Design a protein around this nucleic acid. Structure first.
Ligand SMILES: C/C(=C\C(=O)OCCCCCCCCC(=O)O)C[C@@H]1OC[C@H](C[C@@H]2O[C@H]2[C@@H](C)[C@H](C)O)[C@H](O)[C@@H]1O
Ligand SMILES: [K+]
Ligand SMILES: [Mg+2]
Ligand SMILES: [Mg+2]
Ligand SMILES: [Mg+2]
Ligand SMILES: [Mg+2]
Ligand SMILES: [Mg+2]
Ligand SMILES: [Mg+2]
Ligand SMILES: [Mg+2]
Ligand SMILES: [Mg+2]
Ligand SMILES: [Mg+2]
Ligand SMILES: [Mg+2]
Ligand SMILES: [Zn+2]
Ligand SMILES: [Zn+2]
Length: 917
RNA sequence: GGGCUUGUAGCUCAGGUGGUUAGAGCGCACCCCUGAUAAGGGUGAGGUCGGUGGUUCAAGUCCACUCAGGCCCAC
């Protein structure tokens, strides 16, 4: 007859293959339907709280692997805290203002000039919300649990109003002020431009050398040797302002003939070389320290009146002559280092290349031809020049293809310098996972210049400022807070819909404008300000949250980004960091650790990992990366992830099928009555559990990925589950020995699925769904197993038994290569003490060595002759087992018997079978 | 160029105060099993630690320089 019918084979419909791309949507569908997000919250209703504040991704485009890495790590954290009983609301957010979106619309074919600000802004909003829906869909497909149905958005009235109140408070503490800054300006478009509207094209520029003297006397500290000058911009000459000097680097030359001017060290060679001067390459003499040449007061001719100073510099040396000269009226950093000191803003020029003030003969022409021929009047006619024509790449208006120039424009600033030390101190009191995180942002805030907070665009939050003709600036608590009031109720659009007096309080009045009339600012705030105020607009505003967030977690680029604008803004108005803990991760690279491009074809997108392999696979990958640095993804990397996932899943499947008939409520064996081998695994489970919780407490998911594998592969699959077959399949269903293993098997099943739940969200649920008798619905609404003390002596004892098992297996291998044995069951193992190990005594405290080694018989003797091979754990002798093969359990027995139609059954199996019938 | 950061076996990772033949899991090779079967067991082969030079009796582990990466600036 057939023996398999009497066997107890595993039973479960839990599939070996995941089918993730088709199973996960259903599971997600159910989680939403049963509003688990809010259920998870009410489950921990009055417990300690954990607030992880989400940084708002930009509402434009497709999520990339970075969004996935970042969101999945966040979910790990909140899920684990939730599973430890913490009330941990996770509310995603979206960054919705900014130039990029205005551009998307324009590129889409919207066209501002043809509808008005109000209609264009609504178009931006409509677009942002559409993008959000798409992104929200993708985020949820990763298995992330969060308030996705009621996320915070920077375009929401309440958020905008909060942002305004932040602007108001900073303005009150005197941290907001109006000034000016140079910006790309297109005389063609009669408007300023951002780098995104700039494209380079070669241009004909007449470069000249205007060597200017060093009169006065304050600068005659070292002779009266003139200071040369070279500008590729003749119109950038009527801007008499300082010169240059890169501290440390010195040299002055002072050479024969001419006037013994000044060049430089690494410059000299490539300086006079083109100066046409080479009257016997005359040698230098009295070089006078560059760096130290500060305040070397020098009158710069051409029709000057003021002498130009010189201060520290940042980047000057190169093919470009050592003589730079400045004029904050038309220069990027030419304005920074050139302003700290009493410096008057130079040059005019209206929205058109035309100027007026200070302009001599050229009082109404342009910045071009009015130079190359006009201003070229004032040149070598006293400053020794060399009018040359050169070609180089130059900034151009991308639509008009015409040249762009720098021009100082009124801008608004946030006074970082006044709150600097305050931010530094808040950082010092901020916790970090790694010390360099603290150092990076520290030096950041330390070397940070003033914050330009204004932009001349329409898609954003308006600076709540009003102007009173007579002078200007109306920015008081009353005015800002009333604007906040309106914004809170109508949103920012109100600003573009109403007149100034409608945006002002109760029939407001001010000394300015005796006629009760007012003007309003038009600039909007920099988007960094928008997100940077998220701690106010969401943490302080929403009921479920609390201002100081337990932590912020984002990419490395946020040290200059959201981490920075958020702390700057929070310290300014609250005096504290908006985050008690700052955790950052790296970027996602390809397999070689190189940037994903597209021209290179090494991208890999989240949407594809999910569709092709599954969200649970994208997640396991995350847990396996050392996120504190850059991480790497590729097809070979993911094939690995797939292979580990299959092993975890398959192992869980086997355990599931073998506890299908186990009812914990009535079949469990007391710990004190478990077979010792079962108590050993129960303790390996406790050890693995303790270790994993610790890892979760430290955000060390990589350690869990590593340990889970070793526990699943080595302890379970390789050993316990294998050895268990001779028990689970053969013993009587309700026998003490079978129920003892099931008792531990069940606990491991349950606990391990719970311990993995934060990571393998879908599979954990699917396994939970196939486990009999689990209390709660959903693993995700259950608590982590409690950490208990392990029996260390039991562990050491079995650790040694395991190392002894390896020697046996080695002995079994040798014998198997010799065809002496096939499966380990056809073997008889004899072992005895060695000089290296007292095997005989040690093996005395173990039961059923034959089952433990998966062999038919084990004989412990005491001593073996010089036939037995020696092992680290004793001498071992392997030979084919005695007796005949029992057709049921496949162990060899010398006492096979028949039970009715079933022959060749060992005594053990005869008993099990007889109890069937 | 500046701040911070990474480089150990095919892959992902371990390797306190420097000290015998650098560890793990997977993968791979070969063998066994065929009662987890688009499964399972076993053995074994692979790194000299990005490079060079030093400190030291002795360095993956300390120093210097260097190569190739990464984020953010300077640009
Ligand atoms: C780890 C990251 C990127 C990455 O790893 O890079 C992924 C690789 C890019 C894909 C290449 C595509 C081809 C393009 C080509 O051709 O070159 C960065 C992270 O992102 C997610 C979050 C985004 C929000 O903005 C952040 C904040 C806090 C603020 C409010 O804005 C997170 O905070 C962080 O910023
Ligand atoms: K088999
Ligand atoms: Mg680790
Ligand atoms: Mg294995
Ligand atoms: Mg390597
Ligand atoms: Mg490697
Ligand atoms: Mg590492
Ligand atoms: Mg191996
Ligand atoms: Mg080498
Ligand atoms: Mg050496
Ligand atoms: Mg020596
Ligand atoms: Mg060491
Ligand atoms: Zn061109
Ligand atoms: Zn039997």
């Amino acid at each position: 007859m057939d023996y398999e019918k009497t066997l107890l084979m595993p039973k479960t419909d839990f599939p070996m293959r995941g089918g993730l791309p088709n199973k996960e949507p259903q599971i997600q569908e159910k989680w939403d339907a049963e509003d688990q997000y809010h259920k998870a919250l009410e489950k921990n209703k009055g417990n300690e709280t954990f607030i992880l504040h989400d940084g708002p991704p930009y509402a434009n485009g497709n999520l990339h692997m970075g969004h996935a890495l970042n969101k999945i790590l966040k979910d790990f954290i909140v899920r684990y805290k939730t599973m430890q009983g913490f009330y941990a609301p996770y509310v995603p957010g979206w960054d919705t203002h900014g130039l990029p979106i205005e551009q998307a619309l324009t590129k889409k074919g919207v066209d501002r000039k043809k509808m008005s600000t109000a209609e264009f802004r609504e178009k931006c909003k409509e677009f942002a919300l559409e993008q959000i829906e798409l992104q929200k869909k993708d985020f949820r497909r990763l298995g992330v649990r969060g308030d996705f149905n009621d996320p915070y958005i920077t375009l929401k009235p309440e958020y905008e109003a909060a942002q305004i109140r932040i602007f108001g408070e900073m303005a009150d503490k005197g941290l907001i002020y109006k000034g000016k800054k140079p910006v790309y300006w297109s005389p063609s478009s009669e408007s300023s431009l951002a780098e995104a509207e700039i494209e380079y094209h070669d241009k004909r520029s007449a470069s000249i050398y205007v060597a200017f003297n060093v009169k006065d006397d304050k600068g005659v500290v070292d002779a009266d040797a003139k200071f040369i000058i070279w500008t590729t911009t003749p119109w950038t000459i009527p801007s008499n302002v300082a010169i240059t000097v890169h501290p440390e680097l010195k040299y002055g030359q002072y050479n024969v003939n001419g006037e013994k001017y000044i060049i430089a060290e690494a410059l000299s060679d490539a300086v006079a070389e083109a100066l046409d001067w080479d009257k016997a390459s005359i040698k230098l003499e009295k070089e006078y320290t560059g760096k130290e040449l500060e305040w070397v007061v020098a009158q710069h001719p051409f029709l000057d009146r003021e002498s130009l100073v010189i201060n520290g510099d940042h980047v000057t040396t190169d093919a470009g002559t050592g003589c730079v000269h400045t004029a904050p009226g038309h220069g990027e950093d030419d304005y920074i280092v050139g302003q700290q000191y009493e410096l008057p803003v130079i040059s005019p020029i209206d929205d058109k290349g035309v100027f007026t003030e200070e302009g001599g003969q050229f009082e109404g022409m342009f910045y071009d031809k009015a130079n190359k021929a006009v201003t070229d009047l004032l040149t070598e006619k006293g400053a020794l020049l060399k009018l040359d024509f050169i070609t180089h790449s130059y900034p151009h208006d991308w639509r008009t293809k015409k040249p762009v120039i720098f021009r100082a424009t009124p801008q608004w600033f946030a006074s970082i310098s006044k709150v600097r030390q305050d931010i530094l101190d808040a950082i010092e009191n901020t916790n970090f996972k790694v010390n360099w995180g603290k150092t990076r942002i520290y030096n950041m805030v330390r070397d940070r210049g003033e914050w330009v907070i204004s932009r001349q665009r329409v898609w954003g939050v308006p600076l709540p400022v009003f102007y009173a003709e007579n002078g200007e600036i109306i920015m008081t608590k009353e005015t800002v807070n009333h604007v906040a009031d309106l914004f809170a109720e109508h949103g920012s659009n109100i600003w573009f819909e109403r007149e100034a007096k409608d945006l002002l309080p109760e029939g407001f009045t001010h000394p300015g404008s005796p006629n009760g009339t007012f003007t309003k600012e038009t600039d909007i705030m920099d988007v960094w300000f928008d997100s940077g105020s998220s701690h106010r607009g969401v943490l302080e505003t929403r009921p479920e949250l609390s201002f100081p967030a337990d932590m912020y977690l984002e990419g490395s680029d946020q040290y200059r980004g959201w981490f920075n604008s958020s702390i700057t803004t929070s310290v300014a108005t609250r005096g504290v960091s908006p985050y008690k803990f700052l955790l950052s991760h790296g970027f996602v690279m390809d397999g070689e650790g190189k940037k994903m491009s597209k021209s290179l074809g090494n991208v890999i997108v989240p949407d594809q990992v999910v569709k092709q392999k599954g969200a649970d696979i994208a997640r396991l990958w995350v847990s396996s990366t050392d996120y504190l640095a850059d991480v790497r993804i590729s097809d070979e990397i993911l094939k690995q992830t797939s292979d580990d996932y299959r092993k975890i899943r398959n192992t869980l499947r086997f355990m599931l099928g073998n506890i299908n008939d186990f009812n914990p409520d009535t079949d469990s064996i007391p710990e004190s009555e478990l077979l010792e081998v079962d108590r050993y695994l129960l303790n390996r489970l406790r050890e693995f559990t303790a270790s994993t919780i610790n890892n979760y407490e430290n955000f060390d998911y990589l350690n869990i990925y590593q340990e889970v594998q070793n526990f699943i592969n080595v302890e379970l699959s390789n050993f316990y589950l294998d050895y268990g077959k001779d028990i689970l399949y053969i013993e009587q269903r309700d026998s003490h020995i079978r129920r003892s293993m099931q008792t531990v098997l069940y606990q491991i099943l349950v606990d391990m699925t719970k311990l993995l739940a934060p990571i393998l969200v879908h599979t954990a649920e699917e396994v939970w769904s196939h486990t009999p008798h689990v209390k709660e619905e959903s693993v995700h609404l259950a608590d982590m197993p409690k950490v208990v003390e392990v029996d260390q002596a039991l562990l050491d004892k079995w650790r040694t038994f395991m190392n002894l098992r390896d020697d046996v297996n080695r002995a079994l291998e040798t014998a198997r290569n010799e065809k002496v044995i096939g499966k380990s069951l056809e073997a008889k193992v004899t072992i005895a003490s060695n000089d290296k190990f007292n095997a005989s005594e040690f093996l005395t405290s173990f039961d059923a060595l034959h089952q433990l080694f998966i062999v038919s018989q084990v004989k412990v003797v005491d001593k073996l002759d010089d036939q037995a091979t020696a092992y680290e754990h004793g001498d071992i002798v392997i030979e084919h087992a005695d007796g005949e093969k029992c057709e049921r359990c496949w162990n060899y027995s010398e006492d096979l018997g028949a039970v009715d139609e079933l022959t060749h059954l060992c005594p053990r199996c005869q008993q099990v079978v007889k109890s069937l019938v």
